[model samples]
Each structure stands twice: as structure tokens, then as C-alpha cells.
Target: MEMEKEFEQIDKSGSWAAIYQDIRHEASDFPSRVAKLPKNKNRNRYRDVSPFDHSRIKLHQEDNDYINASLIKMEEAQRSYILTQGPLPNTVGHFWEMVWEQKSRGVVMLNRVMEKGSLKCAQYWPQKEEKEMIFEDTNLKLTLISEDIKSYYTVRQLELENLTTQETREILHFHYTTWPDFGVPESPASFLNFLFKVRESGSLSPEHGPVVVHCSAGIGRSGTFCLADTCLLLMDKRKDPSSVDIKKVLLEMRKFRMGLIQTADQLRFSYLAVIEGAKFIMGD
Candidate 1:
């Protein structure tokens, strides 16, 4: 079967019937198990969105185990990613704690700080005039050393310092500010450009800790980025784009965390981005 077959149908019908149908058929809807847990009631940014308990991120400290983050590592693809929800107002401390503990060299933010009328994520990083921003709750500080403003995205060089340890590391903040929360991007060209830019930074390299990828819920948009990047690498390795099993790969990706690639539209976009990324990998 052609890996791009479903995407091809979408190109014509402008529909996601096939993928949506498949999504409905699969018994993959994460049950509301975590919602019933009283401990996590106030930990989530949104009332309905909660990380699946089995894969939920646990803090090293015994006092708490509720960051709504997951460390997903794909050994076969040599990719390691920490999938997490956007920081909640109360959990901003946990966010930085996870970043410090994970040793992630970069963060791939797929949503804006504020969208529509909702606060998708807190202002977790630094401000230009301030030069440095501190998370009083976490006792961690982020200093913005430089920034690159682009048409659709912005890259910032930040230094995350552990106040107690006096340890600090240079971190890259790759913020894709233009993607719609529930829908796909306008085009894969701009997105692919952003992905390649992150790739060029060596932040995604295995030599460093997993790159933290997140959005409002952390699964939908974040999963799309991981799927596309992994599939493209497989294409480069196999020397055949069609050989990559996009569906099967996503299933594997879901094992590390729940609700990855949230909607069928996201799955559809992953295909489009993968097909487009093939050209870049081939130097086209």
C-alpha cells in the first residue's frame, strides 16, 4: 500500500473521512481514568484534559508525581522526546523542574502564550527588556541572551539556571507562533522550514537530552511534529518513502504517551508534512 495513499485522497476530496473513520474504529480513546484521581484534579490546566496515569510524568521527589509530562524515547529511530502539556499557572514550577531534570537542550513550543480568549501556556521564558525571568515557585531563572524574529516563528537563546545548584545550561526555545490550536497549518512549507531549523540546531540530536515538545494539551500538535520528523528520517534511511508505515509508527509513538496526534486532521497533516519533507531530505 502506498504510504501517501490516504493523503492523496485528501488532496482531491479535501476530506479526512478515511483517517477519521480509522480513528473512530480504533479503540484508542484514552479513558477518563486520570480525571477520577483526586491528586491530579488541580494539576491540569484544563478540567477535561489530563495525562493518562500509566504514562504520566512523575517528579523525582516523593512529595509529588504530577507534572503532566511524559518522556517518550524511540530507540529504533534514535529519537528521544519529552511530551508535555503547556505549563499551567500553578504548575509553572513543575515545568521548569522537569526541564532541569530532563536536561533537555531545547523546547519546541507549538502554540502561543495566549490564544483566542484562553491562556494556552504561561509566560515561562524570559522577556527582552527584563533580560532574565525567574520562576519564583521553582527557584529557576531563564535569561534571554538573543532572539531571531522570523515571519512565522521565533528562536531564542535562553540560559536556564538552577539557583540552588548554581548550574546552568544554554537552551533553545523554538516557538512556532502561527499554528492554529485545533487545525492544521496553512502550508507544510513553513512548518517544514521550522522543523529543519530545529534540526540544524543540534538540539534534536541524541547527544543531548530529549527535546521537550508541547502545545495546549501536549498531544495533538506535539505528536504531529514527532511523527513527521521520525517518518522523514526513516525515509532517508530506507531510501524509500513508501516503505515507512505511518499508521503503525504512530501507534508505536502512542505507547509512550496517550492521545498523541489528537485528531484525524492532525494525522492527515502529518502525512502531508511527511510527503513534503521527503523532498528536503532528498535535497530537492
Candidate 2:
């Protein structure tokens, strides 16, 4: 009942700011040498955001193996999430290279390509007219097989082809278009429905590799998504949602990356999403 009581207290008092500050202070200051190197400077989407060296997902490149992406593994929940920033224009190939090398089955994108007259992420995937995009740097070809557009999100079916080996794989692309920059969704119910949508696909199962999740910075929204998903799955196993410590789970996840759940608001949203999601699992 620890988690339930904590949530109740936060709800009644609206004191999430203090809890979020403690979590951030405890999770700060991890080494990330690779991302700060001069040679890998352009690989990062944002100047300040970078992945920790110990848990960074390294690409098998000849000279450089840096990509601003982290391999967040929550073993207890049986979940492995590749949380990364939206791909930079130059690092699009490296992004695909990571997906191909990791053997990932899906990419969960939580931000739009353009927001408020700013380019948040590169147009990594193919557009409707082109139907396909070939990344010469990585020697990979991505073709759009199908797309199912919804009000706030889109489910795409993409074919990733390794031109060098001619081996192909079906990659599911889950894009949430309505989430604003540095902001939560309109409500936890909408976010929970989207989380369940991704879960229903089975792409996040242990049978497959890690699911690549990204927002603009790959920390705030990305961490929120992963934290809520991990907690709900843990609840399913423990049969007692309160046994899962939301702050501790996030602190553990932040070891692999830095500045996860960037804003106090994002942290509150995560708790809200987890609480709403647990009701479903608890069968009430």
C-alpha cells in the first residue's frame, strides 16, 4: 500500500513538486563521455542532453560508436527500452543502424516532426508520396508498407531492408502526434489508452528486442512513457500495485540515462497514468 498511500497524499496535498525534486537530485550526475566527444558532437540532437556511457547503445561503426540513445533495462518488469532523442538530420542512418543491430521490433515516437514552428525531429521515415527512403550511409532501405491514421496517433507498418545482406524486417512505427513539447497529454486516460495500444502489439515483449522510445529530448516524455509502462507491467506480476515504488523505479531507470522525467509535471503525469492503468489491471 505504499504506492497507493503516496499517490493519495500527493492527490490531496498537490505536493508532487517536492517528490519530483528529490528524485531528480538523487538521479543526477552520471558519466557520459562518449556523447561529449568532439567527433560525436553532431550525433546529438540537443547540446545538453546525452546518454550515460555505461548504458548507451553503441553502434558498430568503424571509427565512431556514439549515438545519443540509452538502453534502459528494467529486468524485474521484463522490459528493455531504448530511449533516445529524436534523430538528428545527420544521425538518421545511425538511428536505423541501431534498430537493425538491436533487432528491435518497433519504434515508439511520442512527438511530432514539427511543433510550434520548430523542427523537433528529422523526417526519418518515408512520406506518403515517396513511400520509401534509402539511407546510403547505413546501406538500409525503409519502405512504408501501410499506415493507419487515428485522431491523435498513427500506427505505421514499415519494411526495413538491409541492402548489404538483402534481409528485411517488418518494423512497427507507433507515433503519438498530439503530445506537445515539454508537456503531458490532455489526460492520463488518453495516454493510458495509447500505452495499452503499444502493449497490445507485443512488440515490447521479451521475445523481441528493446522498443525504441523517443520524444524531443528523449528524457521527459520518453521517460514518462517507459516509467508508466514498466509500473503497470510490474503490477500485473506482483498482483499488488502498491508494491511497486514509482520513484524508486524511475530512479533505477535513470541510472542508464540522465534527466529522465525532466519536468515535475511529467512526474505527476506518470503517477496519474500508473494509477489509472492499475485500476484496469486490478479489475475494478
Candidate 3:
């Protein structure tokens, strides 16, 4: 009730721009020391969009233990998400390494490999022809087993093998292809249906380590998905949709990662998705 009223008020008046401006600046002071190291410079997609030191995921190796990823855990909702930038060519192996080490069951990718004639993300996974891709550095091999292509999204089942141990695990890759670079999905229903699809796979549950989520920079579309997911979850748990404060939840999440929900449009889209999702969850 409160969320809908507030959204209607701000949306009708076109005040989202001013509201989002303040939200973005509020948590801009967190430190991300490890991301700024000279050795880790080349690993980042965008220099400014780095993971905070405390919450960043380390590769658990002897050396070169850097990856542009963050662990966004919402204890209240029993949710854990590994938010990261799309893999650079050199770091593709490391990306899989993190997936294996983190014990993640699924990866929610919100952006495409190519957007608007530009390479937004390296083609990290393999195709049917290629069948498998080997990452010598991490000693891992990834093979595509199946693919379900929808109009707006594609779901693929991948098998990840650890060359060192000869053990393998199946990983689900959910790719939403139509989400624009700086915009949201066409509607909240589309986004939530895809989100529920991921949830139906039991990938986002606490029983797993964490689901890796990424977009181009790891802070825009990625953040929007996490925000909407977490907010809807909190509403369900609390049994009162009005109990959750959208802006406050976002600020809390930004403590673990920087510049989440990048644009005002994305912020507004999050509200729309959450409100719509609440309707489905709360049955009102």
C-alpha cells in the first residue's frame, strides 16, 4: 500500500530523477582497496565500478586472487548473490573458477554478449559446435548440454569439469537477451516470470552457495534484478508488503556493492517490478 502510493506520487510528478540522484550519492564512500591494486587494474571492466574490499569474492588461490565480483547477501531474506562484471577474455577461466569454488548452482546474466554492435561481454561459454571450452589457468572445462531459447531469454544447462580433480557439476545459465544497455525489460511481468523461472530451478535458494549475477558493468541491470528479488522476498517473509521500505533496502544492499541500480530509469523499474511482484506474492 505504502509503496504503491509513494510510487504513484513520484511517478505522476516525474520526481524519480531527483529521488534516484540522492540514492546514488548516499553510499558513494565505501572503500574498494583490493580492486585498486596495480596488479588488479587490468581485471576490471570499468575502473570506477569495482567491488568493495570487505565483500568482494577472492579466488582462494596462492596468487592472482582477484576477480571483479561481490557477494551480496541479504540475511533477512536468506539470499546470497554473487554480483560481478562480465568476464574479460583473460578472466573467463577465473569466472568459472569462482563459480566452482563458490559452489554456485546458477548464473543470472542480465546482459548479452554483444549489445549495439559493441562487445559488452566475452563469449565465456561454449556452443554446440565447440561443445566444450577449456580454461588452462583454472584447469576447468565447460560443456553445453542443453539450451531452451525463449523470445526474450535463453536458458542453458552447462557442465563444469575440474581438470585437476576430474569432477563435474551442472550449472544453469539464465540469459535475458533483450534488456537494453541502459534500460529495463519491456514489462515487470516479463522480468518477474524470468526471475521465477530461475527460482523454480532452486538456484537462488540458501541451500546453494550463491547465484552469480552479472551485466555489462555488474552494477546496473544486475543490481536491478537483485533489488527486485530481495524486496519481493522480504515482503513475502514479513507477510506485510507495506513493511518493506524500497529505498532503505537498496541503501543496505549498496553497502556490499557499489553503484547498484545505476540509472534513475533502472531505479524506477525496480519499484515497478517489486510492486508488481508483491501483488503476485501477497495476493492483493
Candidate 4:
């Protein structure tokens, strides 16, 4: 990646980036969502992960709907994101319930449903057009309106209908099928294309509720996607890259959710995306 090359000068007298790392090292306030773990103890499909307390979303008096879901909001960008882990067997209904309650316009899914032999995300969406997946527990029906499949990604227009309310809202499921689970994307260019696909739909607008974003754990790849997308959105706002501070902005985002940009590679990839996006904005 030409990301590291974009910098012509080094800020040896660093403040923002280095300080952000220093502050992160000093903080110990991570959420466990202890009271909000999966209620179905026997059906433990997810591998030991939960949303944080401050940002965790609670169902409307539905205790069984507790999945690792969180609401991540960036104040400056007015980007309200609902972050969550992949749906478990029993938690699939809860996932749709949260989407219905939040009125989210789209869902950003990063990890493929399966990796090796492990089941990462439950196959919650309908597989074919006119076919519907009904969540008996949540009394929700997700119907496939349409689909657009690419080499590495799949975009589907789904209609989530509440069996209770008989009301329906269109939702976009932007699923990246070929992204590596324990690794980074194949290229920043491809990742940016995926990001723009989400943006082009107008689902990420402030007019709609927060867009629900999830990966296997809702922190690693999900965080990477949100961080890069938010930085690009920030860059899209001001003509100058200095208008938005990447490290500072990420640190602020971490205040809402825990362990965003889960690995060094992911963090590095985030910087790469930002540099490339800044170049694009600068017409280079």
C-alpha cells in the first residue's frame, strides 16, 4: 500500500497520534455487558463476546433479545452507528428486532458467515428473491427484495416487516464475502469501493437512524470499517485533511464502544485508507 508514502515529513514532535495511544494505554474502562449476555445459556453460538454497557442497545422489554449490540455515535459527523457481533442461532431474532426498533436504513456486515469450519455469523438474511426468513422468536420477517452480487461482495435490498405492527421498511445488507477474518482487506481501493456503495444508497444519512454495522465480534473489522468510513466522511466535509484528526477522532469513537481497530494491522490499514481517501479528496 502507498499509504505510508503519503507523508512527506515526520512529526517527531508528535502530540495527537502519540498522545492518543498514550491515553488509550492508560484507560481501563472497558465494558463487559455483563447483565446483557445471551439469555439462552445452552445455545451459546457466539464465541464469548458482548457489547459495552454505555453503548449497548436494550430491547423493548424483550430479555431474550440480548445480543452483543452497541450504538456508536460520532458527534462531529452526526454518524450514529449500531455496532454488534454476528447473530447467534437464538440471537438472530434479536438482531432484527434491534434493527426494527432503531429504524436503521442499512446493515454493514464485514465478516463472511463462515471462516474455515467455524460459523461466524448466523445466516439471518433471506438467500433468494421472494424467499423470506422468518424469526419466530421476534415475530419478524425479512424478505429479499433484490440483490447485486460482485466478485467479493453482495448487496441485497431487504424488507424487514414486523409481524406485530405490519409495518415495513426497506434495508440494505452490504455483505463483504471475501474479506479475511483475522486479516486486512485485499486492498484499500476495493474497501473504499465497498464503502462508497454503502454511501451511494443514501442509507447512511442523518435523516435515517443509525446504520447497523457488524462483523464476527463487532469490534475488529467493524471498527476498521467505521473508522475508515468516518474519516472519509470527515474528509468529505472539509477541503483540508487537517480539518479532521484521525487519531483524535478514533479515540473519541472508542469512548462509545470498546476495542475498536482490534489489531495493529487493522489500525495500520485504517491509516492507509485515510491517506488514500485524503488524496482522492485532494484530486490527486
Candidate 5:
């Protein structure tokens, strides 16, 4: 028996080819061909399993007092070894209150935008926030990059700012996406490439540090990337794969950052991505 062939219809109305031609006619720099990828269903396959319990976690905090107090303690303990990502909440007074508390040590903040509203969260921190902020005191040295690519000098400035401290030498940034191109096989490859670049550039190290990564909520992309890196590192050490525990690592992270891996979708994506990455690395 022979199987029947089936075909899906393509919409020719306001055709892509025609639009491309029209665009090319107006711009000489336009490329001749556009690369395309298969679109994945935009479905919410994962749902919220439970609300994170902040009260149980020692480092987790909901109010400014908790955050400020904790920052002071973290500074005292780690000194110049803390990193953060995303924008500080809009509450300026509370934000500065926390900053002042942590000011005794080094601090670094990473964000995509470098505006005062986006970068520095304090009223007295700086009138005009630069693309990056690096401060070193008796107790600590800190670097903050706003993730503004146009401001390449910010990264250089950060490097220069940390040149004096051997114990505090590490690059920290946010929105480190491994699979930026969604629903594509090459996306994972691109992510690995980025990881290699960071590793080669010494941005991610354990002795000095691993890059402190985070997104808006500090859970989804940030948690996944962090966990993925942790798993890979463990595999490198030839640790028993069966003994590897994802929940333990996640629980510890949650204890520090309330919603380190916020949603079920984020958790699922992170889990699958890391597992696939491990298998790829091990050629399994």
C-alpha cells in the first residue's frame, strides 16, 4: 500500500517575497535572502506549582529592612564576593537605604539600560548614572555594568576598576542566554559558544567566581543558566551522575534569592536544557 502525500498551504497575501523585494528596493544594504526557522507553538505548557515561601528562607526578604540587613551581613561574610543583576525596585529611599548598608563592601549591578532610574536605585548614589559603576572600599571592591553594548567602555572600566584586587577579580553580568534563538537546534549550540567565550575570557570562575547572572525576577533565565553551569561543572569533576541532586541546589538558591526559578515553565526549560547540555557534553 502507498501512503498519500499531504501539504500545508502557505499564505501568499502580502507575500514575504514581495515585501522583501520592496524593502530591498528602498535600501541597498538589505540582504538578498532571509533566513527562517520553524515556529514553535506559543503554549503555556507549565503552570505555577506553588508560591515561594520567603519566611522560611534566611536570606530571602520581602521588605526593605530585611534586604538591607541581609546585605550588611552578606557584605560582612563574603566581602568583595557578591554580584547582582536587574533593576532595583522603584522605591528610591528603600533602595538607597540598602545601598548605604552594602556600601562598606564592593558592589556590582548589571542591567540592559544605563539610566539612573534603571541603574542606580539610590537617590544619593549618583546624579548621573554611567553605563557601569565600580566602587572599592576598605572592605570590598565592586563592579556594575548596565549591559549597554554601545557603552563598551563600561566593561573596560569595570576591568580597570577591579585590577587592584586579586581576590575580587571576576566578571559578573545579567541576561546570559544560552538558547537565545528560541525553538531552534542551533540555539543550544549558540548558548554553548557563549559559555565558552565567558569561560575563556575568565568571566566565569569558582576561585575568583562564576559570573553572577540574573534577569528581572532572578528565577527563570538566571536560575536555569546558573543550574546548567553547576551541573556541567559537576560532570567535569567526574562526579557520579546518579548522586547529582537538582532539588538541593535549587533549594539553596531559593534560600538566598526568593524566586530563583520562578515559574514552572522556567523550571521545565532549565531542567531540559541542562540535561540536554550534559548529554551533549558527555556524548551520551
Candidate 6:
């Protein structure tokens, strides 16, 4: 018995016309001799040697086409991962909420101030019941650090009385450097020290998470803190002072959190903080 040949005729020139046209059009600006060069015999050389008969080739093409269609699906998956993994529980209302959907999971919420207005709002809010733990850091000492009250929150005031700019810098440096430990100290070397600490830590605890910084109405101080934080993160990741994309990061943060680092002065301060942190971390 004799076995039959699987491929009767393999016409390499069958689909050459379209490929030739694409090459010609794309090479219009090339010299005439170069542009008119015949198709190289090596074109699709690997494909020609592939161990696939005609039916197998057809099946391979179908598989490839299906995989090509899945590009969008893959892209969607990537986008979901980037968005979900990029940030922690988003801030809702005037406070940030780190909620766990299941009852078995632990929950943590941080607040700077829990005024009567905020307490009232928290009681009726949809996710209020989900807040199992709350932590506060402020300059004032209050008596309401208890879990019994349904809507009440607690406070752990820092010793911030009569704090001059120097004292403030010292405290911030202590908190930032001791926490992250990633960046270097800036000249007059306080803010950068703190920022380095924050970066090194990788994760911020609920008690020492991002400072829910605020002043009157929580605008000036809050915005400044956020702007500084954003700048610091960007610098830490990029590790290059001149190559930093400040505007892009600031604009992105603004889109997500409205009125982010609202004041021009605050924005300037953020840039300074990042530069200082980078210098300290890099030993520049």
C-alpha cells in the first residue's frame, strides 16, 4: 500500500498580490530600484515550513482569528485590574470608607474630625453600619472616644498646641519618614523625611493611613495634603526630578477628587515636597 501526499500543490504566489500592493504603496518614497524589488523568497518562510496540512492550516487560522478577537477582552481585564489595584477604598461624602462587603471581614475608617454634623450624617448613611472601627488624629483632645454610641467616633489628638511652622515640619517629618522609609530628606530636611517613611511602609494603617488633613471647611489643609501626597507618590515611582509629569498627575487627581489641592500655593508646596523627598531619597 502507498500513502497519498497531504499537500497536492502549495502555491506561494496565491496571496502575493495584496502583500505586493501593500509593500509598493508603503515604499512610495523609496528609490525606484528599491521600491520595485521582487518579493523576497524568505517571505513567510517559517509559515511555509510549518508542519500543518491544508486543513490544519485552516484550523490554525481560525484559532488565530479567535485569539485576535479576544484582544478586547484581554484589554478590559487589564483595565479592571489597573483600576481596582491602583487605589484603596475610595472616599465617599466628606470621609473615606474602607468597607468590607462580608461581615467576616474587618473594616477601618479614619477621620480627622467628628463634629455633631458629621456624626448625624454618619448615623443614617448607607455604609455607616459597615464602619466597624474609626480612628482620628487631631490637635484637640475630646472626651468622645467610645464605641458604644451608634453614630459617635473617636479621636487621638496629637500634641499640636502652639505649633510653629518648624514644629509642624518636625511632626510631619517624624510621621512621614518613620512610616514610609523610602525617600530622602529635603533641605531643612523635614518633609522629605516623612515622605520617605510613608513610601517605605508600603501600606498605611487605619490609625496612620493618609492624614484626613483639614482646616476650616477641610479645603485648604485637605487639598494641600492630597496634592503633596500625589506629588510624592509620583516622584517616588519615577525617581527622576526633571522627567516628572506634574501637570498630568495633578489633573488626574483633580478629575477623581474634585477641588484637589485647590490653591496655587498648595500646589506649589506639593511640588516642593516631592522635589525635597526625591532629593533626600536619591541623596542628591
| Index of the highest-TM-score prediction | 3
| TM-score, every prediction | 0.90, 0.95, 0.96, 0.86, 0.44, 0.33
lDDT of 2 by residue, 5-121 (tens): 788788789888898888877885778888898888888878889898889998998778888999998888888999999998999999999999999999999988998889999
Residue 207 displacement (Å), model 4:
1.3
lDDT of 3 by residue, 49-89 (tens): 98988899999799889999999888898898999999998
User: What does candidate 4's lDDT look like per residue over 82-181, in tens digits?
Assistant: 8888887777888898898888899999888879778887898988876689898889988999988898799998999899889999999999888875
Worst 10 residues of 1 by lDDT: 27-36
| Model 5, span 1-284: residue lDDT tens | 00001001112242434432432244212111111111211111112211122321122233312221111112111212222334333332322223333322212232233343444223212313353333332122334433334211122223223234444432333223222322223335545444554555545443442233434333455555565566566656644664555555555444443345544444444445555667666864
What shift in Å separates residue 24 of candidate 6 from its native position after superposition? Answer: 50
Error of 1 at 64 (Å): 0.7
Which candidate model has the greater TM-score, 1 or 3?
Answer: 3
- Model 1: per-residue lDDT, tens digit, 148-238? 9899899999888999899989989999988975578868998899999999999899788889899988888898999889888888777
Query: How high is the CA lDDT of each candidate model?
Result: 0.81, 0.88, 0.90, 0.76, 0.35, 0.28
Better of 1 and 2 by lDDT: 2
Ranking by TM-score: 3, 2, 1, 4, 5, 6
Model 3 C-alpha lDDT versus the unseen true structure = 0.90
Task: Count clashing residue pairs per candidate.
Answer: 0, 0, 0, 0, 7, 16
Quick one: how many clashes does candidate 3 have? 0
* Best of the two (2, 6) by TM-score: 2
Which parts of model 3 have CA positions greater than 4 angstroms off? none
Off by over 4 Å in 4: 1-24, 27-48, 62-65, 238-240
